[PDB]
C-alpha cells in the first residue's frame, strides 16, 4: 500500500493529502513529530530513495521524492493530468501560478523580520489572486467541471494566506466561494473533520509565521 | 514559428532554450534588455496570457507562462515526458531535485548578504550533487540512454554553480563528464558557439551573484 512520509505539519504535502482523500485511495501516512528529526536522519538513507528528502512516496517498486512529482503521480495514475499536450501544460501552469503564492509565503515565513516582509508580499498578493478569479470566472474549478489537483493546491494556498491576512479574500468573493465549494466535496468534508486532519502548523515549527504548536 | 519571451539572461529559461536547440525546433525569441522593463509591462497584458509573467511561450493560442509548464510542454510535444506513471514521475523527481539546486542559487543570489550565504549553500551542495553522481552511475543521461529535459536542467545548474565555485565538481568527475557530454551533442555545441547564445548574466542584472553586464 501507498506510504506518504512527511512532517506532522501541513506544508508542502497538504495538497497531496487532500487530493488523496478525494480519490478515496487507500494510503498509510508516515509523519515525523517536531522532535523526531533524528528518526528521519536515520531512515533517510535506508528507504531506497535516489534523492532522499521529505516528503517521500513509496507504494512498491516506486519510491518518489519532491512534493510535485509525488502529487503529479497520484493524479497521473487516475488520468488527471490532461488528455493532450496543450491541456497538460495548462494544468502545469496552474500548478506553477499557485506555487508562486504558496512558496511566496514560505520565503518569508522562517525569517525573523517576517512582519516587515509580509507587507510587500500582501502588497503584491492582490494581482496574483486576481488571475485565479479570472480563471475561475465561468468555471466550477480551475480546469472546468472536473476537480484537478491544482485545485487542492490553490485551496491550500488560500487557507494559508487567510491566517496571514483574513481580509485578503474579501475583494474576491469568487475565491471565497471556491474555497467553500472545495470544502463541500463529501470526501474533503470527512477529512477536515476526521482525526487525520492536520490543522496546524502550516510551516515547520521553528517558523516565525505559521510555525508553533498552536494557532495564534 | 513559436515565440519564447524572457529577459536576455540565462535565468529561468536557459534549460528550455537548450532543449529547443536540441530538437532543432525552430522558434523566435522576444528578448527584454536590461533597461526594457517598461516595454514588457507595455505588452505584459496585450498578449492574452491568463497569468501574465516571464518567461512566456506562445504559438497557436497555446499561451503559457511558468518555466516548468513551458519546458514540459516543448518536451511533451515531442513525447519526452515519460511512457507511463512511473517513468513520468521519475522524470518529475529529477525536475525537482535539479531545481532544488538551481533555485538554491537564486534565492541567496539577490541578497546583499550573498558573500556569507553562499558559504552555507556550498557546504550543502556536495550532498546534492552526489545524488546526481549516483543516478549517473551506469547511465549516460539521467533517466536512461535517451536525453530528457532534466538533463538540460542539471547542465544549466552545473554551469551556474561552477561560477560560484570553480571547484565544486572536482569531487564529481562523473558530472564534469556529463557536462562535456552534453556540450558534445552537435546541435548543442553548435548553439553555444552561435550568436543566439546568451553567455551572461546568470541572474537578473540586479543580482549580486551572476549579475552585472559582464562576468567578473
PDB file of N, CA and C in Angstrom, chain A residues 72-154:
ATOM      1  N   UNK A  72       1.916  14.871  -8.741  1.00  0.00           N
ATOM      2  CA  UNK A  72       1.725  14.662 -10.168  1.00  0.00           C
ATOM      3  C   UNK A  72       1.495  13.163 -10.435  1.00  0.00           C
ATOM      4  N   UNK A  73       2.100  12.317  -9.613  1.00  0.00           N
ATOM      5  CA  UNK A  73       1.990  10.870  -9.764  1.00  0.00           C
ATOM      6  C   UNK A  73       0.604  10.361  -9.394  1.00  0.00           C
ATOM      7  N   UNK A  74       0.211  10.599  -8.151  1.00  0.00           N
ATOM      8  CA  UNK A  74      -1.091  10.169  -7.669  1.00  0.00           C
ATOM      9  C   UNK A  74      -2.189  10.510  -8.669  1.00  0.00           C
ATOM     10  N   UNK A  75      -2.082  11.681  -9.287  1.00  0.00           N
ATOM     11  CA  UNK A  75      -3.066  12.143 -10.261  1.00  0.00           C
ATOM     12  C   UNK A  75      -2.921  11.453 -11.606  1.00  0.00           C
ATOM     13  N   UNK A  76      -1.683  11.332 -12.070  1.00  0.00           N
ATOM     14  CA  UNK A  76      -1.401  10.709 -13.356  1.00  0.00           C
ATOM     15  C   UNK A  76      -1.869   9.272 -13.406  1.00  0.00           C
ATOM     16  N   UNK A  77      -2.013   8.651 -12.243  1.00  0.00           N
ATOM     17  CA  UNK A  77      -2.477   7.275 -12.189  1.00  0.00           C
ATOM     18  C   UNK A  77      -3.976   7.211 -12.453  1.00  0.00           C
ATOM     19  N   UNK A  78      -4.692   8.251 -12.042  1.00  0.00           N
ATOM     20  CA  UNK A  78      -6.126   8.322 -12.255  1.00  0.00           C
ATOM     21  C   UNK A  78      -6.395   9.280 -13.422  1.00  0.00           C
ATOM     22  N   UNK A  79      -5.518   9.248 -14.422  1.00  0.00           N
ATOM     23  CA  UNK A  79      -5.637  10.108 -15.598  1.00  0.00           C
ATOM     24  C   UNK A  79      -6.200  11.501 -15.302  1.00  0.00           C
ATOM     25  N   UNK A  80      -5.535  12.241 -14.418  1.00  0.00           N
ATOM     26  CA  UNK A  80      -5.987  13.576 -14.053  1.00  0.00           C
ATOM     27  C   UNK A  80      -5.029  14.699 -14.440  1.00  0.00           C
ATOM     28  N   UNK A  81      -4.080  14.442 -15.337  1.00  0.00           N
ATOM     29  CA  UNK A  81      -3.134  15.490 -15.732  1.00  0.00           C
ATOM     30  C   UNK A  81      -3.401  16.101 -17.101  1.00  0.00           C
ATOM     31  N   UNK A  82      -4.378  15.580 -17.835  1.00  0.00           N
ATOM     32  CA  UNK A  82      -4.654  16.134 -19.149  1.00  0.00           C
ATOM     33  C   UNK A  82      -4.615  15.100 -20.254  1.00  0.00           C
ATOM     34  N   UNK A  83      -5.510  15.243 -21.222  1.00  0.00           N
ATOM     35  CA  UNK A  83      -5.575  14.289 -22.310  1.00  0.00           C
ATOM     36  C   UNK A  83      -4.604  14.553 -23.435  1.00  0.00           C
ATOM     37  N   UNK A  84      -4.253  15.816 -23.637  1.00  0.00           N
ATOM     38  CA  UNK A  84      -3.323  16.169 -24.704  1.00  0.00           C
ATOM     39  C   UNK A  84      -2.231  17.108 -24.188  1.00  0.00           C
ATOM     40  N   UNK A  85      -1.170  17.315 -24.984  1.00  0.00           N
ATOM     41  CA  UNK A  85      -0.055  18.192 -24.617  1.00  0.00           C
ATOM     42  C   UNK A  85      -0.525  19.549 -24.078  1.00  0.00           C
ATOM     43  N   UNK A  86      -1.203  20.333 -24.914  1.00  0.00           N
ATOM     44  CA  UNK A  86      -1.710  21.646 -24.501  1.00  0.00           C
ATOM     45  C   UNK A  86      -2.323  21.625 -23.102  1.00  0.00           C
ATOM     46  N   UNK A  87      -3.437  20.926 -22.953  1.00  0.00           N
ATOM     47  CA  UNK A  87      -4.106  20.853 -21.664  1.00  0.00           C
ATOM     48  C   UNK A  87      -3.169  20.500 -20.501  1.00  0.00           C
ATOM     49  N   UNK A  88      -2.242  19.567 -20.724  1.00  0.00           N
ATOM     50  CA  UNK A  88      -1.308  19.171 -19.673  1.00  0.00           C
ATOM     51  C   UNK A  88      -0.352  20.287 -19.252  1.00  0.00           C
ATOM     52  N   UNK A  89      -0.204  21.292 -20.112  1.00  0.00           N
ATOM     53  CA  UNK A  89       0.651  22.431 -19.816  1.00  0.00           C
ATOM     54  C   UNK A  89      -0.208  23.468 -19.096  1.00  0.00           C
ATOM     55  N   UNK A  90      -1.510  23.455 -19.397  1.00  0.00           N
ATOM     56  CA  UNK A  90      -2.466  24.368 -18.779  1.00  0.00           C
ATOM     57  C   UNK A  90      -2.499  24.033 -17.306  1.00  0.00           C
ATOM     58  N   UNK A  91      -2.541  22.744 -16.998  1.00  0.00           N
ATOM     59  CA  UNK A  91      -2.579  22.336 -15.607  1.00  0.00           C
ATOM     60  C   UNK A  91      -1.215  22.501 -14.929  1.00  0.00           C
ATOM     61  N   UNK A  92      -0.138  22.448 -15.710  1.00  0.00           N
ATOM     62  CA  UNK A  92       1.200  22.599 -15.152  1.00  0.00           C
ATOM     63  C   UNK A  92       1.433  24.051 -14.859  1.00  0.00           C
ATOM     64  N   UNK A  93       0.736  24.887 -15.622  1.00  0.00           N
ATOM     65  CA  UNK A  93       0.820  26.327 -15.461  1.00  0.00           C
ATOM     66  C   UNK A  93      -0.010  26.775 -14.258  1.00  0.00           C
ATOM     67  N   UNK A  94      -1.083  26.057 -13.959  1.00  0.00           N
ATOM     68  CA  UNK A  94      -1.909  26.399 -12.816  1.00  0.00           C
ATOM     69  C   UNK A  94      -1.034  26.050 -11.645  1.00  0.00           C
ATOM     70  N   UNK A  95      -0.469  24.853 -11.745  1.00  0.00           N
ATOM     71  CA  UNK A  95       0.443  24.285 -10.763  1.00  0.00           C
ATOM     72  C   UNK A  95       1.485  25.340 -10.384  1.00  0.00           C
ATOM     73  N   UNK A  96       2.137  25.904 -11.392  1.00  0.00           N
ATOM     74  CA  UNK A  96       3.142  26.915 -11.150  1.00  0.00           C
ATOM     75  C   UNK A  96       2.595  28.146 -10.470  1.00  0.00           C
ATOM     76  N   UNK A  97       1.643  28.806 -11.132  1.00  0.00           N
ATOM     77  CA  UNK A  97       0.993  30.018 -10.632  1.00  0.00           C
ATOM     78  C   UNK A  97       0.556  29.914  -9.169  1.00  0.00           C
ATOM     79  N   UNK A  98       0.066  28.746  -8.762  1.00  0.00           N
ATOM     80  CA  UNK A  98      -0.328  28.565  -7.375  1.00  0.00           C
ATOM     81  C   UNK A  98       0.906  28.569  -6.464  1.00  0.00           C
ATOM     82  N   UNK A  99       1.950  27.836  -6.851  1.00  0.00           N
ATOM     83  CA  UNK A  99       3.185  27.774  -6.064  1.00  0.00           C
ATOM     84  C   UNK A  99       3.806  29.147  -5.816  1.00  0.00           C
ATOM     85  N   UNK A 100       3.726  30.038  -6.794  1.00  0.00           N
ATOM     86  CA  UNK A 100       4.289  31.361  -6.595  1.00  0.00           C
ATOM     87  C   UNK A 100       3.613  32.034  -5.426  1.00  0.00           C
ATOM     88  N   UNK A 101       2.491  31.482  -4.992  1.00  0.00           N
ATOM     89  CA  UNK A 101       1.784  32.044  -3.859  1.00  0.00           C
ATOM     90  C   UNK A 101       2.189  31.253  -2.624  1.00  0.00           C
ATOM     91  N   UNK A 102       1.947  29.948  -2.666  1.00  0.00           N
ATOM     92  CA  UNK A 102       2.267  29.095  -1.535  1.00  0.00           C
ATOM     93  C   UNK A 102       3.733  29.189  -1.137  1.00  0.00           C
ATOM     94  N   UNK A 103       4.617  29.250  -2.126  1.00  0.00           N
ATOM     95  CA  UNK A 103       6.033  29.352  -1.823  1.00  0.00           C
ATOM     96  C   UNK A 103       6.356  30.799  -1.475  1.00  0.00           C
ATOM     97  N   UNK A 104       5.665  31.731  -2.121  1.00  0.00           N
ATOM     98  CA  UNK A 104       5.888  33.129  -1.815  1.00  0.00           C
ATOM     99  C   UNK A 104       5.743  33.326  -0.318  1.00  0.00           C
ATOM    100  N   UNK A 105       4.906  32.496   0.297  1.00  0.00           N
ATOM    101  CA  UNK A 105       4.663  32.544   1.732  1.00  0.00           C
ATOM    102  C   UNK A 105       5.814  31.967   2.539  1.00  0.00           C
ATOM    103  N   UNK A 106       6.343  30.825   2.131  1.00  0.00           N
ATOM    104  CA  UNK A 106       7.433  30.253   2.898  1.00  0.00           C
ATOM    105  C   UNK A 106       8.798  30.890   2.697  1.00  0.00           C
ATOM    106  N   UNK A 107       8.892  31.863   1.795  1.00  0.00           N
ATOM    107  CA  UNK A 107      10.167  32.541   1.593  1.00  0.00           C
ATOM    108  C   UNK A 107      10.341  33.452   2.801  1.00  0.00           C
ATOM    109  N   UNK A 108       9.233  34.034   3.249  1.00  0.00           N
ATOM    110  CA  UNK A 108       9.254  34.943   4.383  1.00  0.00           C
ATOM    111  C   UNK A 108       8.698  34.359   5.680  1.00  0.00           C
ATOM    112  N   UNK A 109       8.387  33.074   5.704  1.00  0.00           N
ATOM    113  CA  UNK A 109       7.827  32.507   6.923  1.00  0.00           C
ATOM    114  C   UNK A 109       8.824  32.183   8.032  1.00  0.00           C
ATOM    115  N   UNK A 110      10.049  31.826   7.676  1.00  0.00           N
ATOM    116  CA  UNK A 110      11.016  31.496   8.711  1.00  0.00           C
ATOM    117  C   UNK A 110      11.882  32.697   9.084  1.00  0.00           C
ATOM    118  N   UNK A 111      11.836  33.758   8.277  1.00  0.00           N
ATOM    119  CA  UNK A 111      12.614  34.964   8.580  1.00  0.00           C
ATOM    120  C   UNK A 111      12.167  35.625   9.887  1.00  0.00           C
ATOM    121  N   UNK A 112      13.113  36.158  10.646  1.00  0.00           N
ATOM    122  CA  UNK A 112      12.771  36.807  11.911  1.00  0.00           C
ATOM    123  C   UNK A 112      12.007  38.115  11.661  1.00  0.00           C
ATOM    124  N   UNK A 113      12.311  38.760  10.536  1.00  0.00           N
ATOM    125  CA  UNK A 113      11.654  40.012  10.164  1.00  0.00           C
ATOM    126  C   UNK A 113      10.466  39.709   9.261  1.00  0.00           C
ATOM    127  N   UNK A 114       9.751  38.643   9.601  1.00  0.00           N
ATOM    128  CA  UNK A 114       8.587  38.236   8.839  1.00  0.00           C
ATOM    129  C   UNK A 114       7.562  39.348   8.714  1.00  0.00           C
ATOM    130  N   UNK A 115       7.442  40.167   9.755  1.00  0.00           N
ATOM    131  CA  UNK A 115       6.472  41.262   9.770  1.00  0.00           C
ATOM    132  C   UNK A 115       6.751  42.328   8.724  1.00  0.00           C
ATOM    133  N   UNK A 116       8.011  42.725   8.621  1.00  0.00           N
ATOM    134  CA  UNK A 116       8.387  43.738   7.652  1.00  0.00           C
ATOM    135  C   UNK A 116       8.222  43.217   6.220  1.00  0.00           C
ATOM    136  N   UNK A 117       8.521  41.934   6.017  1.00  0.00           N
ATOM    137  CA  UNK A 117       8.409  41.297   4.704  1.00  0.00           C
ATOM    138  C   UNK A 117       6.962  41.128   4.217  1.00  0.00           C
ATOM    139  N   UNK A 118       6.104  40.572   5.075  1.00  0.00           N
ATOM    140  CA  UNK A 118       4.697  40.349   4.759  1.00  0.00           C
ATOM    141  C   UNK A 118       4.033  41.564   4.119  1.00  0.00           C
ATOM    142  N   UNK A 119       4.539  42.756   4.397  1.00  0.00           N
ATOM    143  CA  UNK A 119       3.930  43.935   3.811  1.00  0.00           C
ATOM    144  C   UNK A 119       3.982  43.858   2.290  1.00  0.00           C
ATOM    145  N   UNK A 120       5.180  43.987   1.725  1.00  0.00           N
ATOM    146  CA  UNK A 120       5.322  43.936   0.277  1.00  0.00           C
ATOM    147  C   UNK A 120       4.639  42.698  -0.298  1.00  0.00           C
ATOM    148  N   UNK A 121       4.684  41.590   0.438  1.00  0.00           N
ATOM    149  CA  UNK A 121       4.052  40.367  -0.040  1.00  0.00           C
ATOM    150  C   UNK A 121       2.558  40.556  -0.257  1.00  0.00           C
ATOM    151  N   UNK A 122       1.841  40.893   0.813  1.00  0.00           N
ATOM    152  CA  UNK A 122       0.395  41.118   0.739  1.00  0.00           C
ATOM    153  C   UNK A 122       0.111  42.292  -0.197  1.00  0.00           C
ATOM    154  N   UNK A 123       1.125  43.120  -0.415  1.00  0.00           N
ATOM    155  CA  UNK A 123       1.002  44.249  -1.306  1.00  0.00           C
ATOM    156  C   UNK A 123       0.902  43.703  -2.739  1.00  0.00           C
ATOM    157  N   UNK A 124       1.616  42.613  -3.019  1.00  0.00           N
ATOM    158  CA  UNK A 124       1.586  42.024  -4.358  1.00  0.00           C
ATOM    159  C   UNK A 124       0.605  40.874  -4.486  1.00  0.00           C
ATOM    160  N   UNK A 125       0.034  40.435  -3.368  1.00  0.00           N
ATOM    161  CA  UNK A 125      -0.913  39.321  -3.391  1.00  0.00           C
ATOM    162  C   UNK A 125      -2.155  39.548  -4.253  1.00  0.00           C
ATOM    163  N   UNK A 126      -2.791  40.730  -4.149  1.00  0.00           N
ATOM    164  CA  UNK A 126      -3.985  41.008  -4.955  1.00  0.00           C
ATOM    165  C   UNK A 126      -3.836  40.601  -6.431  1.00  0.00           C
ATOM    166  N   UNK A 127      -2.806  41.123  -7.100  1.00  0.00           N
ATOM    167  CA  UNK A 127      -2.550  40.810  -8.511  1.00  0.00           C
ATOM    168  C   UNK A 127      -2.621  39.309  -8.812  1.00  0.00           C
ATOM    169  N   UNK A 128      -1.924  38.524  -7.998  1.00  0.00           N
ATOM    170  CA  UNK A 128      -1.894  37.080  -8.163  1.00  0.00           C
ATOM    171  C   UNK A 128      -3.292  36.511  -8.034  1.00  0.00           C
ATOM    172  N   UNK A 129      -3.915  36.733  -6.886  1.00  0.00           N
ATOM    173  CA  UNK A 129      -5.274  36.243  -6.657  1.00  0.00           C
ATOM    174  C   UNK A 129      -6.212  36.606  -7.806  1.00  0.00           C
ATOM    175  N   UNK A 130      -6.012  37.790  -8.376  1.00  0.00           N
ATOM    176  CA  UNK A 130      -6.825  38.279  -9.487  1.00  0.00           C
ATOM    177  C   UNK A 130      -6.832  37.296 -10.668  1.00  0.00           C
ATOM    178  N   UNK A 131      -5.658  36.795 -11.025  1.00  0.00           N
ATOM    179  CA  UNK A 131      -5.549  35.857 -12.132  1.00  0.00           C
ATOM    180  C   UNK A 131      -6.461  34.643 -11.955  1.00  0.00           C
ATOM    181  N   UNK A 132      -6.505  34.101 -10.741  1.00  0.00           N
ATOM    182  CA  UNK A 132      -7.318  32.927 -10.436  1.00  0.00           C
ATOM    183  C   UNK A 132      -8.792  33.237 -10.476  1.00  0.00           C
ATOM    184  N   UNK A 133      -9.159  34.428 -10.021  1.00  0.00           N
ATOM    185  CA  UNK A 133     -10.558  34.805 -10.050  1.00  0.00           C
ATOM    186  C   UNK A 133     -10.943  34.807 -11.518  1.00  0.00           C
ATOM    187  N   UNK A 134     -10.103  35.406 -12.352  1.00  0.00           N
ATOM    188  CA  UNK A 134     -10.399  35.434 -13.771  1.00  0.00           C
ATOM    189  C   UNK A 134     -10.530  34.011 -14.303  1.00  0.00           C
ATOM    190  N   UNK A 135      -9.586  33.155 -13.938  1.00  0.00           N
ATOM    191  CA  UNK A 135      -9.606  31.769 -14.375  1.00  0.00           C
ATOM    192  C   UNK A 135     -10.885  31.090 -13.886  1.00  0.00           C
ATOM    193  N   UNK A 136     -11.253  31.327 -12.628  1.00  0.00           N
ATOM    194  CA  UNK A 136     -12.464  30.732 -12.043  1.00  0.00           C
ATOM    195  C   UNK A 136     -13.782  31.313 -12.571  1.00  0.00           C
ATOM    196  N   UNK A 137     -13.693  32.450 -13.249  1.00  0.00           N
ATOM    197  CA  UNK A 137     -14.865  33.088 -13.821  1.00  0.00           C
ATOM    198  C   UNK A 137     -15.426  32.142 -14.886  1.00  0.00           C
ATOM    199  N   UNK A 138     -16.627  31.628 -14.638  1.00  0.00           N
ATOM    200  CA  UNK A 138     -17.290  30.710 -15.560  1.00  0.00           C
ATOM    201  C   UNK A 138     -16.755  29.275 -15.538  1.00  0.00           C
ATOM    202  N   UNK A 139     -16.182  28.865 -14.408  1.00  0.00           N
ATOM    203  CA  UNK A 139     -15.655  27.507 -14.243  1.00  0.00           C
ATOM    204  C   UNK A 139     -15.959  27.077 -12.817  1.00  0.00           C
ATOM    205  N   UNK A 140     -16.276  25.801 -12.639  1.00  0.00           N
ATOM    206  CA  UNK A 140     -16.563  25.283 -11.307  1.00  0.00           C
ATOM    207  C   UNK A 140     -15.233  25.057 -10.606  1.00  0.00           C
ATOM    208  N   UNK A 141     -14.220  24.779 -11.419  1.00  0.00           N
ATOM    209  CA  UNK A 141     -12.872  24.534 -10.954  1.00  0.00           C
ATOM    210  C   UNK A 141     -11.898  25.113 -11.973  1.00  0.00           C
ATOM    211  N   UNK A 142     -10.641  25.222 -11.561  1.00  0.00           N
ATOM    212  CA  UNK A 142      -9.587  25.774 -12.394  1.00  0.00           C
ATOM    213  C   UNK A 142      -9.526  25.218 -13.809  1.00  0.00           C
ATOM    214  N   UNK A 143      -9.904  23.953 -13.975  1.00  0.00           N
ATOM    215  CA  UNK A 143      -9.855  23.342 -15.298  1.00  0.00           C
ATOM    216  C   UNK A 143     -11.227  23.080 -15.926  1.00  0.00           C
ATOM    217  N   UNK A 144     -12.292  23.388 -15.193  1.00  0.00           N
ATOM    218  CA  UNK A 144     -13.622  23.159 -15.719  1.00  0.00           C
ATOM    219  C   UNK A 144     -14.468  22.448 -14.691  1.00  0.00           C
ATOM    220  N   UNK A 145     -15.424  21.652 -15.146  1.00  0.00           N
ATOM    221  CA  UNK A 145     -16.298  20.945 -14.223  1.00  0.00           C
ATOM    222  C   UNK A 145     -15.673  19.728 -13.550  1.00  0.00           C
ATOM    223  N   UNK A 146     -14.383  19.495 -13.772  1.00  0.00           N
ATOM    224  CA  UNK A 146     -13.726  18.355 -13.141  1.00  0.00           C
ATOM    225  C   UNK A 146     -12.568  18.743 -12.238  1.00  0.00           C
ATOM    226  N   UNK A 147     -12.659  18.316 -10.988  1.00  0.00           N
ATOM    227  CA  UNK A 147     -11.636  18.602  -9.995  1.00  0.00           C
ATOM    228  C   UNK A 147     -10.234  18.150 -10.407  1.00  0.00           C
ATOM    229  N   UNK A 148      -9.315  19.100 -10.546  1.00  0.00           N
ATOM    230  CA  UNK A 148      -7.940  18.770 -10.907  1.00  0.00           C
ATOM    231  C   UNK A 148      -7.078  19.007  -9.660  1.00  0.00           C
ATOM    232  N   UNK A 149      -5.927  18.343  -9.567  1.00  0.00           N
ATOM    233  CA  UNK A 149      -5.086  18.504  -8.384  1.00  0.00           C
ATOM    234  C   UNK A 149      -4.656  19.945  -8.094  1.00  0.00           C
ATOM    235  N   UNK A 150      -4.507  20.790  -9.127  1.00  0.00           N
ATOM    236  CA  UNK A 150      -4.104  22.143  -8.769  1.00  0.00           C
ATOM    237  C   UNK A 150      -5.168  22.805  -7.914  1.00  0.00           C
ATOM    238  N   UNK A 151      -6.365  22.232  -7.917  1.00  0.00           N
ATOM    239  CA  UNK A 151      -7.448  22.785  -7.116  1.00  0.00           C
ATOM    240  C   UNK A 151      -7.132  22.664  -5.629  1.00  0.00           C
ATOM    241  N   UNK A 152      -6.664  21.496  -5.207  1.00  0.00           N
ATOM    242  CA  UNK A 152      -6.308  21.299  -3.812  1.00  0.00           C
ATOM    243  C   UNK A 152      -5.076  22.137  -3.531  1.00  0.00           C
ATOM    244  N   UNK A 153      -4.314  22.409  -4.581  1.00  0.00           N
ATOM    245  CA  UNK A 153      -3.136  23.222  -4.432  1.00  0.00           C
ATOM    246  C   UNK A 153      -3.567  24.654  -4.158  1.00  0.00           C
ATOM    247  N   UNK A 154      -4.487  25.171  -4.964  1.00  0.00           N
ATOM    248  CA  UNK A 154      -4.970  26.531  -4.756  1.00  0.00           C
ATOM    249  C   UNK A 154      -5.689  26.607  -3.420  1.00  0.00           C
TER     250      UNK A 154
END
